[PDB]
Amino acid sequence: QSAYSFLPQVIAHRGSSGQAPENTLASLHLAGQQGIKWVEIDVMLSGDGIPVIFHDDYLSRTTDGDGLIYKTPLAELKQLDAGSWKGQEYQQETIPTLLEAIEVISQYGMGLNLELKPCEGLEEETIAASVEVLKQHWPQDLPLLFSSFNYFALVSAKALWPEIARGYNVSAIPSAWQERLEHLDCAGLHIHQSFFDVQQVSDIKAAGYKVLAFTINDESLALKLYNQGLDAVFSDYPQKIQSAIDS
Amino acid sequence: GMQSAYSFLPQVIAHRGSSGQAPENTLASLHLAGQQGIKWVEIDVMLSGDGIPVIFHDDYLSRTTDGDGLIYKTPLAELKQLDAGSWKGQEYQQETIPTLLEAIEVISQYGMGLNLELKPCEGLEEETIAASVEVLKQHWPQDLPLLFSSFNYFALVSAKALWPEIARGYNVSAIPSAWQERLEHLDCAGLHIHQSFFDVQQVSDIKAAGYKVLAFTINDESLALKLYNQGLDAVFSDYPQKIQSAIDSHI
């Protein structure tokens, strides 16, 4: 059941996104082959309601296209180049569907922390469509963790697939962290590294919760935070972080 | 007055002040909106590293200042050394990141209404709203409209908890299928949507149910006029004076 029972120390942030284009099959393959145990990727819907893997509202940063992804049909998305901005050898990469990403992730036996990143207002539809795909295609023997910054997304996730573990994403640790985690029924708090507080973290851990932090790309900082009780980091250079731990 | 702000909603709101020409979210853009005769402004609020409400849009400093790093982790004294105008134009070189207090001073001078968008650091919603409410309860003129809005759930819950008499708007990109449930849940009197998600059928339903509908960010006067004709109550614009002129001259 709970993905947190299998939480590794290092999670590849948007796949192995330091050296391959974020949120692509390429970055998922790289994470898989680098021996990273879990990936994190972001999910939202295309204009025609299909779960796709992408971070920004707009297309221009990570593709050759322009406009709102939320307003763009999958068929149009699929002819954009989602890799060349990272490097020309990735020019065949496209925005993956959630289904496509699942196939690659499961090939390597990796866990998936799917960050629900719905278009604001489209939380219910985004979670519903993502849950449908996952219920029929995600392997029961691999860890699946939902997380979100978005309250409605977390409520919907619990409503539509309660057995799947949930993490609450924040930047700063809320003063009311306990009441929020209890209310949202989340087993983990995922925080921004700049807001790590060893004392608050110790209290959160004392209370039985996992604590994770993003996005850590410096080996020394990762090790510093693990020593202070951080359960996992999200990293763009996950192989480098793991090399540091294992040394 | 400040309560029931939607009763005083103009058709045009200056998005981050008059931000097409002047640097967004500065005293300059607020003065420009005032001088252009715009009736309300919208500006974004969050806390400095030392807990002071400041007017700023991004998490990071580099887009609209010569600074670097997270505004949430930077003390006010350090923020005030930053140049928040040169990126827009050399004439704006002296502009700083305003405190909410400083912004209120300029806004009130022109007798403009304020739609304050609560943009707290995620997780710091309760502290951000508390700090902002303190400033406003002390300094916001009671005879000018004040509207809180946010994309953030906990921000809207905190606003109602700490100062229920001030009207609230729910910011989204798309109109939720459960818009009615949401607006009643959050106790909001208006829905603010992204222009690309304007849906005349849904908007008519929302209007008929007693809520205001606003859209951002519209800089094309022809589009603005079409949307008003289809029931939209207000636009947020970077060129609010141009939109107003289109409204006033339409035959």
Ligand SMILES: O=P(O)(O)OC[C@H](O)CO
């Ligand atoms: O990188 P973001 O903006 O998707 O957020 C940080 C992590 O991804 C949370 O899962």
Ligand SMILES: O=P(O)(O)OC[C@H](O)CO
């Ligand atoms: O421009 P944003 O990103 O602050 O979007 C919300 C609009 O400003 C309307 O409040």
Ligand SMILES: [Cl-]
């Ligand atoms: Cl780092």
Ligand SMILES: [Cl-]
């Ligand atoms: Cl790496």
Ligand SMILES: [Cl-]
């Ligand atoms: Cl008006």
Ligand SMILES: [Cl-]
């Ligand atoms: Cl920066």
Ligand SMILES: [Cl-]
């Ligand atoms: Cl200039």
Ligand SMILES: [Cl-]
């Ligand atoms: Cl009150």
Ligand SMILES: [Cl-]
């Ligand atoms: Cl426009």
Ligand SMILES: [Mg+2]
């Ligand atoms: Mg993410």
Ligand SMILES: [Mg+2]
């Ligand atoms: Mg591009």
Ligand SMILES: [Mg+2]
């Ligand atoms: Mg275009």
Ligand SMILES: [Mg+2]
């Ligand atoms: Mg395929």
Ligand SMILES: [Mg+2]
């Ligand atoms: Mg705003």
Ligand SMILES: [Mg+2]
């Ligand atoms: Mg100029």
Ligand SMILES: [Mg+2]
């Ligand atoms: Mg200066």
